[PDB]
Amino acid sequence: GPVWRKHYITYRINNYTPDMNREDVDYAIRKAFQVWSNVTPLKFSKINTGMADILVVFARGAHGDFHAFDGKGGILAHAFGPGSGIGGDAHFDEDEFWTTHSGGTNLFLTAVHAIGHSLGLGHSSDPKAVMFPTYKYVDINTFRLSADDIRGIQSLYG
């Protein structure tokens, strides 16, 4: 449905996974937002005071919405499309083991996908798109938005 009317957008990390150290969580999330700001007029800013447009939450099982997480494996993450309140928020399953690299579920890659939803994208049919609804680890230096991702997001934020 609706897209952000404004081009200045805040995010707050509600809480931290104990799987990675704090600085690595910040880094992953920052880099994930950068991916999208790189191809749009959107500007993202992290806050810890006031109210963020996008709340980033790590939680297991039932966590206050109607989409409970399911333990280790399966559902990794979900996010809500643009809007007030819960709109834009991105939730990560704490029962996953979040990693800077290949040996669990990579936070950066998962967050790029989740944030795509937070900005209003649905799933892609293109297996090389970040919005493809299958997790597959890629070298975070071999990482790139596909043409379908870029086309998609630019159709929303021209």
Ligand SMILES: COc1ccc(S(=O)(=O)N(Cc2cccnc2)[C@@H](C(=O)NO)C(C)C)cc1
């Ligand atoms: C690359 O980033 C990813 C983030 C999340 C997932 S996810 O497996 O958790 N996933 C898609 C899915 C996969 C398999 C079977 N049913 C649903 C959720 C999803 O698409 N959330 O955004 C779905 C259950 C809502 C996969 C990849």
Ligand SMILES: [Ca+2]
């Ligand atoms: Ca929100």
Ligand SMILES: [Ca+2]
């Ligand atoms: Ca899970």
Ligand SMILES: [Ca+2]
């Ligand atoms: Ca965990």
Ligand SMILES: [Zn+2]
């Ligand atoms: Zn719902």
Ligand SMILES: [Zn+2]
């Ligand atoms: Zn949730």
Ligand SMILES: [Zn+2]
């Ligand atoms: Zn998804």
